[PDB]
Design a protein around this nucleic acid. Structure first.
Ligand code: ZN
Lengths: 134, 149, 52, 129
RNA sequence: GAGACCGAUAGCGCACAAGUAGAGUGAUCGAAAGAUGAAAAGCACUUUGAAAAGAGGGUUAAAUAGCACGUGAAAUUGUUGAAAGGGAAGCGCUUGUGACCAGACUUGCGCCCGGCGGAUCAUCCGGUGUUCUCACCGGUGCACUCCGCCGGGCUCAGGCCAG
RNA sequence: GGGACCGAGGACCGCGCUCUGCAAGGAUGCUGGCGUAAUGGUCACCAGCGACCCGUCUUGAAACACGGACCAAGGAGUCAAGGUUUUGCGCGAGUGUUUGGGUGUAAAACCCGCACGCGUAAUGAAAGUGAACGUAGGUGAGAGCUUCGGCGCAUCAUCGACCGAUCCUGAUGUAUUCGGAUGGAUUUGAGUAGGAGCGUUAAGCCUUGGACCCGAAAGAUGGUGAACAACCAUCUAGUAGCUGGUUACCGCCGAAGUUUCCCUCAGGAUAGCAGUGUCGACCUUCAGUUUUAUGAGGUAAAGCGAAUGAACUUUAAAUAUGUAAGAAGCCCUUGUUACUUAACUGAACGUGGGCAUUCGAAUGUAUCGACACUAGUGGGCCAUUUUUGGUAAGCAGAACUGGCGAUGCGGGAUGAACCGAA
RNA sequence: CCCACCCAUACCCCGCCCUCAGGGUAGAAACGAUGCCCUGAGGAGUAGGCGGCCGUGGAGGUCAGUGACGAAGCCUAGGGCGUGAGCCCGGGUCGAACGGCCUCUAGUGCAGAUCUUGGUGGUAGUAGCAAAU
């Protein structure tokens, strides 16, 4: 019923949708690789899904959804710790997301890349703000 | 325009100002063009007129679309069942009027020419024999082709 | 994506007509007339020419 | 066409399937079935059990009867022969009377798995007006 | 007792002095009009002068909320400022002059060396939850690996407009 | 060689070429400038060129005519019942719970016992009768399938079959005056020939209600005053014509101003123009066109050392204008008929052939045809040519075409009718 | 009679908008198959037909929406978006509630009606001191 869910999600109502006037729609669901609402990146309408998230302690994880733990919403996600070395984390995506749709592999690598880049940017801002004292 | 020149100007694919078509001379075609002499100018083109019309303003009819003859390949996929597989074949068929002129001329989209460089004669809408531009000018169509194309 | 004039760029000319190379190489546009002393116009053609 | 007139989400599911099959298969069966899916409900008249029996009573037995319409029961058809019918919908009386005769009931998506090119199928439609 | 009703030019004519004010000989006809503030704390007192008015001064979170009272549009009007105006103005395209106003790429990553601290590093130990193999704690240390941090050196990367 | 405008696209693929890569399916390389301002906005004004005040109404059109002192708020196709078309949905020879009952977390939701509405067999004025002789039939098309041999949906054409009714023929027989069997008809059915309906949702149209909003004189009922009959309230938001007005944007398709019929004038019904849906052909077929043949002009002309004499012709214009140019076609052979003829002499039904890889001119072809359903239209003014009549001269009437009408732009200094060009 | 020159929204080339027509797209796509990609043609428009979209009052669900550290409203010689109806932000004022999405609903959009109610002009400090006050 994966397609029947998508038709209800796309064309009737979805609580995570944010409709903007700028020619693009956004998904507010926290387990989505891209913020956009499309068929590839809707985690509700894809029984098999992957997502890269960052913890408050600074750890980056990879989340896995399978069709088997679908009726159990508390056990939707397998949480796998990603390496701090950027190359081993990219490889860890490739082994774990093996035989997935290539959209999920390509966007999880992008989501891993932006999360590491923001973390480096976060440390450069905090160092400059401490020096500036404003 | 009277109703009968309007029908002839549609059968000759002359649906716009500065539209050009290659016709073969019969008694059927000569009488049609003589009626629409108050709107058209025509003559006998040379090789250079035919060659530069196809190379520069040559376009085809592939499934009802106007696609330019940029490659020899699109000639063969639409006219290769008649033995016309190159762009020199289309030149040869149009100029020396051959057995497949019916199919080559209609494959050719009507030539959207520009206004002539240097202009027309001062009194444009008179006969060429009377000092103007309308009618039959025979080999003098080449000077008009060079100015428009 | 862009219509190209064979009369302006000769690469598209060589794409369409491969004979364009040998036409320029052997100067076929500058072929001379066949040899032979041209015989004079007949005198009968001249008196016709300026009859009246 | 461009969009089915129906608001049924599963009829849009079948149009999606038969759009793919009409594009990627030379069989004109798929193109005909896709055209009749886009047609309205009046333009798909119901087909009775009696009408699918007469088009079976010739040497066309052992063929999968395909009717892209609903299948209705005829009370005047006393005995139903063994028959495999694929349709959009079946009434309760029709579904019971095919199953009582030993026949089988298919849907159009079960038809697409079994006979994607429409091999050995008897295509039927009901009376107009 | 209620409402997928109306919200002060609406909703009963009447949210309030409403069949009131008022008109007509009479039968009858019949309006307009809600909102200070949380609390009157509704401006004591000084000082012009004849007033439904000011200047000080005070109350209040606020008086440009002062019983002309929440918010306070437009038409219309005064003052100040700028520009223009030889028998119409207004308007379209395109400059130019002056006045006022805004502010263009968020403006960065990667290498190398040395030190320091951490770990997802040790076939290190104990514990917890779990989808039962994945996570999270605590204590060990730095042989290796990887992150940061500090001090140097180096690299390329970039937004707009020109020639 | 000199100059201008432009740089669309974004891994590779293709065609090539002068092949250690190129100018070959669309601009790169190098250098500089830019933050107390690069670059913009708004206002006021100057300058060049442009440019009638909106709406309504009449008309072929302008011109009149009606409305507009200004601003804010209000303000005009609505709701019921009954029909009808189409889209979606549920069930389907059935469908519809909601009169009512049971029930409840209480006007909600949930459940249904009996009837009832519409449909599920028709016809005839009626008595009444009542759907199979052929795989519910044959033949030919026809979507689709195919073991490539053939099966053949829906639908149509034809030949049949049956039934209701009408006009006949008149069986065993029968109460001695009752019956319709069999065999026919250039018959009729809103018939059968194997059901499609019921409920609901959305949009549109029709009818009636105040009926898109505003707008008479009248009439009537019941009162109040008293006089040149008047006033008041209600019926009453009365009605008839006739005015005025009738509320955001963008995109797509887009007219007609006409033929015919009927009858009140005040109008409808067809056909045409615009559109929607279904079915069928393959883009088949068609076309304000040319050519060929042949009419209507032998119209002009050449000759009469051809004949005869526009009315002469060997020949033959130009120029418009009717009709044909295959497979849905041709010819004849052979049979019948209800038609016709002395007669397959004609018409129709069947038979045969050839050519399907020049199937019988040219050019074009942004598909065509049938059926059903739905809006707005049904005025004219001017000019060219031809032509009928008339005047001192104007002028009046037909036919074709063209322009304007629903049309902006360049020009003719200016402009409904001119020229160019949409 | 000849040579050259001037310019229309016309003709030619290029870019961009939309519409139409054709094509491609699944052991799925690196973009809601109601999506994406490629190609060609076209663009005036009254009566009329069809579609999409913007705005308004209220109703169900949603945004774990905004809000006295300031909602709504209004003003504004400011920054932006959309072809457009419109929409978002800044500055001021202001004080208690309001907004987006998807559906439902209607007493839902004004320049006219010698429109209704209210307010306010020029006429005009004019006519003239009549009536009313
Ligand atoms: Zn989503």
């Amino acid at each position: 019923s994966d397609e029947i869910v998508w038709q209800i999600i796309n064309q009737q109502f979805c609580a995570f949708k944010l409709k903007t006037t700028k020619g693009q729609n956004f998904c507010r669901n926290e387990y989505s690789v891209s913020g956009l609402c499309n068929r590839q990146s809707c985690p509700l309408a894809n029984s098999r899904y992957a997502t890269v998230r960052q913890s408050p302690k600074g750890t980056i994880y990879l989340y896995i959804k399978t069709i088997e733990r679908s009726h159990m919403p508390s056990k939707w996600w397998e949480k796998i710790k990603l390496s701090q070395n950027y190359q081993k984390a990219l490889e860890q995506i490739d082994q774990r997301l093996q035989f997935f749709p290539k959209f999920l592999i390509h966007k999880c690598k992008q989501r891993l890349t932006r999360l590491v880049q923001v973390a480096i940017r976060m440390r450069r801002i905090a160092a400059e703000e401490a020096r500036l004292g404003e | 325009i009277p109703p009968k020149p309007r029908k002839i100007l549609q059968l000759l694919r002359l649906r716009q100002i500065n539209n050009g078509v290659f016709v073969k001379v019969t008694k059927a075609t000569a009488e049609m063009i003589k009626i629409v002499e108050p709107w058209v100018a025509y003559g006998y083109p040379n090789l250079k007129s035919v060659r530069e019309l196809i190379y520069k303003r040559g376009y085809g009819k592939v499934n009802g679309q106007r696609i330019p003859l940029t490659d020899n390949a699109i000639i063969e996929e639409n006219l290769g069942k008649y033995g016309i597989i190159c762009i020199e074949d289309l030149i040869h068929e149009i100029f020396t009027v051959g057995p497949n002129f019916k199919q080559a001329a209609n494959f050719l989209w009507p030539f959207k020419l520009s206004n002539p460089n240097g202009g027309f004669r001062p009194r444009k809408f008179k006969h060429f024999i009377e000092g103007g531009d309308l009618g039959n000018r025979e080999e003098h169509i080449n000077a008009l082709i060079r100015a428009m194309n | 994506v862009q219509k190209k004039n064979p009369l302006r760029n000769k690469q598209i000319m060589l794409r369409l007509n491969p004979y364009a190379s040998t036409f320029a190489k052997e100067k076929l546009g500058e072929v001379k007339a066949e040899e032979g002393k041209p015989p004079k116009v007949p005198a009968s053609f001249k008196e016709l020419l300026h009859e009246a | 066409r461009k969009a089915p007139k129906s608001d049924n989400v599963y009829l849009k599911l079948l149009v999606k399937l038969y759009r793919f099959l009409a594009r990627r298969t030379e069989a004109p069966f798929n193109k005909v079935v896709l055209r009749r899916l886009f047609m309205s409900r009046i333009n798909r008249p119901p087909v009775s059990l009696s009408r699918i029996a007469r088009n079976l009573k010739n040497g066309n037995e052992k063929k999968t009867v395909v009717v892209v319409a609903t299948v209705t029961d005829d009370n005047r058809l006393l005995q139903v022969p063994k028959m495999e019918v694929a349709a959009l919908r079946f009434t309760a009386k029709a579904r019971a009377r095919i199953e009582a005769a030993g026949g089988r009931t298919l849907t159009l998506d079960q038809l697409a798995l079994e006979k994607p090119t429409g091999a050995n199928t008897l295509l039927l439609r009901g009376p107009k007006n």
